[PDB]
Amino acid sequence: MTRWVRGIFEALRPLETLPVEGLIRIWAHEALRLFQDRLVEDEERRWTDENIDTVALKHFPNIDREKAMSRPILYSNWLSKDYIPVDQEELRDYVKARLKVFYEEELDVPLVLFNEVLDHVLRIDRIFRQPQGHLLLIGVSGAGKTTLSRFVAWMNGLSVYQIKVHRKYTGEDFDEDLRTVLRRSGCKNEKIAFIMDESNVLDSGFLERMNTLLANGEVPGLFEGDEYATLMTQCKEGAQKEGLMLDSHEELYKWFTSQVIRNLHVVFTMNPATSPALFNRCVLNWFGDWSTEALYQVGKEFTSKMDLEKPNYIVPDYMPVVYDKLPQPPSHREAIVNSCVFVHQTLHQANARLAKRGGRTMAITPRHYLDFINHYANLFHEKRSELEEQQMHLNVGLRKIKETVDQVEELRRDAKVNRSTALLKSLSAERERWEKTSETFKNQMSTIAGDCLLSAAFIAYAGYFDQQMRQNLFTTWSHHLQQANIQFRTDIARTEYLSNADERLRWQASSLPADDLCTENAIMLKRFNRYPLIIDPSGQATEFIMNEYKDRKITRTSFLDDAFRKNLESALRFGNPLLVQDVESYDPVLNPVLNREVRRTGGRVLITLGDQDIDLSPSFVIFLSTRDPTVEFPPDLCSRVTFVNFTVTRSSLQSQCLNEVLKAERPDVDEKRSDLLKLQGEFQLRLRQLEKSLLQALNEVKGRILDDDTIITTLENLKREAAEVTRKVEETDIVMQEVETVSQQYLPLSTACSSIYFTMESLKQIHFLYQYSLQFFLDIYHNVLYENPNLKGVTDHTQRLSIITKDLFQVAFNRVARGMLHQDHITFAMLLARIKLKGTVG
Amino acid sequence: QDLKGVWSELSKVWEQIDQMKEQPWVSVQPRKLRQNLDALLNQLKSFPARLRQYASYEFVQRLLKGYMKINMLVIELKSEALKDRHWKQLMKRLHVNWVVSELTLGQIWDVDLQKNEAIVKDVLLVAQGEMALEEFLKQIREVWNTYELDLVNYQNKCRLIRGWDDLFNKVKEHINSVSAMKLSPYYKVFEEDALSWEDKLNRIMALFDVWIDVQRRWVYLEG
Numbered sequence A: 001m002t003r004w005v006r007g008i009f010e011a012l013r014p015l016e017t018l019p020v021e022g023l024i025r026i027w028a029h030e031a032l033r034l035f036q037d038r039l040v041e042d043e044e045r046r047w048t049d050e051n052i053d054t055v056a057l058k059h060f061p062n063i064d065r066e067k068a069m070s071r072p073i074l075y076s077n078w079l080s081k082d083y084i085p086v087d088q089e090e091l092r093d094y095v096k097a098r099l100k101v102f103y104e105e106e107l108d109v110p111l112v113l114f115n116e117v118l119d120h121v122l123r124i125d126r127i128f129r130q131p132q133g134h135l136l137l138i139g140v141s142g143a144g145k146t147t148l149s150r151f152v153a154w155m156n157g158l159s160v161y162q163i164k165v166h167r168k169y170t171g172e173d174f175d176e177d178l179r180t181v182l183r184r185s186g187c188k189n190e191k192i193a194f195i196m197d198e199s200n201v202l203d204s205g206f207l208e209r210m211n212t213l214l215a216n217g218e219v220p221g222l223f224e225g226d227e228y229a230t231l232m233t234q235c236k237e238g239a240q241k242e243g244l245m246l247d248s249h250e251e252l253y254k255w256f257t258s259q260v261i262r263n264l265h266v267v268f269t270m271n272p273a274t275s276p277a278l279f280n281r282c283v284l285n286w287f288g289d290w291s292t293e294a295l296y297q298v299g300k301e302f303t304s305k306m307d308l309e310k311p312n313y314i315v316p317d318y319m320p321v322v323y324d325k326l327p328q329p330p331s332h333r334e335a336i337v338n339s340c341v342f343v344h345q346t347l348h349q350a351n352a353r354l355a356k357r358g359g360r361t362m363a364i365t366p367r368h369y370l371d372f373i374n375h376y377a378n379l380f381h382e383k384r385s386e387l388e389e390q391q392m393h394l395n396v397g398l399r400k401i402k403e404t405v406d407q408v409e410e411l412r413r414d415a416k417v418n419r420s421t422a423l424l425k426s427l428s429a430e431r432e433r434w435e436k437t438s439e440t441f442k443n444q445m446s447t448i449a450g451d452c453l454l455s456a457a458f459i460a461y462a463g464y465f466d467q468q469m470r471q472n473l474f475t476t477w478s479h480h481l482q483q484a485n486i487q488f489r490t491d492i493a494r495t496e497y498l499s500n501a502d503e504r505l506r507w508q509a510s511s512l513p514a515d516d517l518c519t520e521n522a523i524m525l526k527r528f529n530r531y532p533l534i535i536d537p538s539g540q541a542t543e544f545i546m547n548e549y550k551d552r553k554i555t556r557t558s559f560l561d562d563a564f565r566k567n568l569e570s571a572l573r574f575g576n577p578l579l580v581q582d583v584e585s586y587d588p589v590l591n592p593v594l595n596r597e598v599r600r601t602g603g604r605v606l607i608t609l610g611d612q613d614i615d616l617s618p619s620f621v622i623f624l625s626t627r628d629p630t631v632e633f634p635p636d637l638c639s640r641v642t643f644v645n646f647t648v649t650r651s652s653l654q655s656q657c658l659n660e661v662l663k664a665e666r667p668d669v670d671e672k673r674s675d676l677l678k679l680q681g682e683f684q685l686r687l688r689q690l691e692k693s694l695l696q697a698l699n700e701v702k703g704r705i706l707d708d709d710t711i712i713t714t715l716e717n718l719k720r721e722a723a724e725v726t727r728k729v730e731e732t733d734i735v736m737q738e739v740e741t742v743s744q745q746y747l748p749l750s751t752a753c754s755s756i757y758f759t760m761e762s763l764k765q766i767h768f769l770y771q772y773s774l775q776f777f778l779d780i781y782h783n784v785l786y787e788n789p790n791l792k793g794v795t796d797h798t799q800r801l802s803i804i805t806k807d808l809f810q811v812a813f814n815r816v817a818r819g820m821l822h823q824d825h826i827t828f829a830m831l832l833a834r835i836k837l838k839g840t841v842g
Numbered sequence B: 001q002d003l004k005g006v007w008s009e010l011s012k013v014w015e016q017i018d019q020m021k022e023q024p025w026v027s028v029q030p031r032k033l034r035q036n037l038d039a040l041l042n043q044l045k046s047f048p049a050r051l052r053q054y055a056s057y058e059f060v061q062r063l064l065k066g067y068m069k070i071n072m073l074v075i076e077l078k079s080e081a082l083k084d085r086h087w088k089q090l091m092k093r094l095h096v097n098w099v100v101s102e103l104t105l106g107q108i109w110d111v112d113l114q115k116n117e118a119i120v121k122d123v124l125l126v127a128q129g130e131m132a133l134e135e136f137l138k139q140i141r142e143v144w145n146t147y148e149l150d151l152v153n154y155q156n157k158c159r160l161i162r163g164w165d166d167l168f169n170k171v172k173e174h175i176n177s178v179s180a181m182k183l184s185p186y187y188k189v190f191e192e193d194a195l196s197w198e199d200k201l202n203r204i205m206a207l208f209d210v211w212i213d214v215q216r217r218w219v220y221l222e223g
Ligand SMILES: Nc1ncnc2c1ncn2[C@@H]1O[C@H](COP(=O)(O)OP(=O)(O)O)[C@@H](O)[C@H]1O
Pocket: A109, A110, A111, A112, A113, A117, A140, A141, A142, A143, A144, A145, A146, A147, A148, A269, A370
């Protein structure tokens, strides 16, 4: 109530006179600022709106509730000299202009202005022009708290100050920081906005100390003795500077406190332990998740520098629209932005579903959405540039081959003539094949947008979920894109599309499994905007990332190590890659590095680490890692990093065993699957390289194209090879159902392997001795597949499969029970029999 | 007519470009530079329709667009990380002479920064790493030229040393950091300073390692 009266008084002070309508409007505006903002649920806000209107009608009857009341009630002194009402459109335009200005002479990252941002900006403005104005921005982490607070403070000309978070933070340091802030604000008449986050409010002593200054605008028992005398000398100086005759100590301290009240503002940032005294001492403003419209506008703005144009894009009837204000008819760009919003909503829905199911689930924040859009932009640029340079290479080859057709015609005008005619027909066949290649390239131009959207969505959002959940999310996204008439290839090999042969083979040279999950994890490790947080209980991923950056002097450190901060300082200063394990015990000092906060002072590009400004090196990269799968991290840490998970599950393991069965028993079908994967981009790249070599050999012509007419074989070779890949395009579907049928045949064996391995790993509940590694089960599996003598001398695939199924249980039981008590042999046999009974059909 | 007017406006914009060029590179401020470039863009856009349809108008139009685009490169080139070595690397890799003491903004404006951005960015990152290492060694010099042993009395007979742990952590940190700098890709021209400093730190570490043992033994024997 006191803050209500104070705000109304501040609004009514510089103004001359109003009707009752203006007083009612400002009263309602202050009521909304003090009560509606602290609300979370929107219908509660609607209830508050309706009841403010009801009370206004009741207490003040016979007053026009349309001239004095509107849905937008916005007050500011930005378009005037008094704190008067002002229309929303000019407010938005002015704030857009000031955002463009704030881009330049400050930290430069793209920002978007929507309705929520505008309201929050006006709220920070209001709290900054209220005496003893203190606000608590509560909401989801990584949504705009610090950015909006600093931006508004810069707009109002307040020197932004923040408390540096450093390992083993000392309370005396906090006291001296408060002393400096108070001296700069009260004495020097400097308007300072003070901002804190959960990374620093973790010590309740700081909060219980600052409650005194939040309530009274002063800290008793802080300025004593020599500090007291020095502050008094400077405060007398400031009082003379302003024009006061005040020279008594106690009244000078009182004037210092009043100046602190008028100038110093404190802003809090938190995520939904905290005393209610903090909640009540300052103003509360809810800062919930970005709305659907907000996400739509972010997608529309950040993709403006991208093509996403299809003039012949047919509008699909029954559009599964998620943004309730999509323009009719939806263009291609609007459709893509709608798809991105739907993707974010599907991540939220999947997290909710896993939360309901009891499984572990980790929060998704607008930072993930921004990362997704950034990855979309980078991948779109990459693929577009690559395909366009291939376009121009094919075109220049077409003119070169036409020039040589003319040259060989000139040579023919001079039995070798018949061979020259054969050369001519071969060249013409090459020419039409290249024209058809250009047509297929136009088709790829059509497909690239959807392909990029799906790949970027897979990279950015997915990465913490297992193989099955990743597949479900990708299926949902692809089904939505198909439902929105978006051109993407009906079959997508993310592993192939996001890499090629050479990175995969060098990863295989590294200590990296050939598992599809592992390949996707490596791809995520390659392309990343936020530093990865590798999750793996085994440790193959850490050794792999070591072997990858071995030449770059990669270093290992753990949060438990006391020298971790020192190694971090060295790596950051020098730019060597750093690997950090045990992120479960996390140190918030890493937050500025993950957030990529840098300042450019002169020739130096520094970063605030702890309490020291470390010079950032332009080659530094960090890899967070952990070994415990069951662990929860705060949503801030989730926002800061991208998650890469190596934990084996039943789906991943069954896919592994299915691949091994296909390799060992049906090498022809696994080879066919490999050819199907290579058909995506590997065969085309090899064919284009052979085309490059043919063009190069063709370039050295001095009449030697017809000397003995022997180079044309290479041409035929190329053409032959071309025909080969063409045939694999024809029977791609046939290979698909063939491999699908054989995988359906072999699937129950893989399910049995997954179930038996999980039974083995759960065996530890019985006795502490019963510990078995994944490598043990794979050893048993390889013994069953390769060095099993029962399979010798038989070729019927069904018979070999049945023999393998029997021997799997037999050998697994033998190997386990030899290292297992006699009392539990029957228990393990019963479990194995239950598994096989579930597996068998009939 | 219209052609005389557009030629006069072209002369005006040529004079403005010449005035911007003649300002030496050591005095041009990129903030004032972008202010003037924006002023020139508004000067071009404010022209009537007839003067907006000429080919020379288009020429100065995308010319100023390219200038505003390369303005960013102008900001990074204006830094303290390229004192003399990196500029000379730029000249030898760009094959155009640009002596800093005679350099003017016009000379940099002459060369195509659309095309030579790769060398610029590479030498920029190299210079950033170099100045990071240089600032670390400066911090080493400042901290070691002022550090002193905290001495406390003992039985009112002599002033012994208190604070062995902090000095040990300081020296070990400095040794580890210089050894890690030895692995940095920018550790080429700082080698002699690094060797001298690691020699000094090894001497300090060994000296104090034996000093603390001597101190403990002596106080034990005195007791
Ligand atoms: N309105 C906005 N538009 C675009 N990006 C934003 C906006 N608000 C915040 N961001 C992004 O958030 C990042 C900073 O995180 P921040 O939102 O400050 O986290 P916190 O929620 O802890 O304040 C910046 O990189 C910025 O790009």
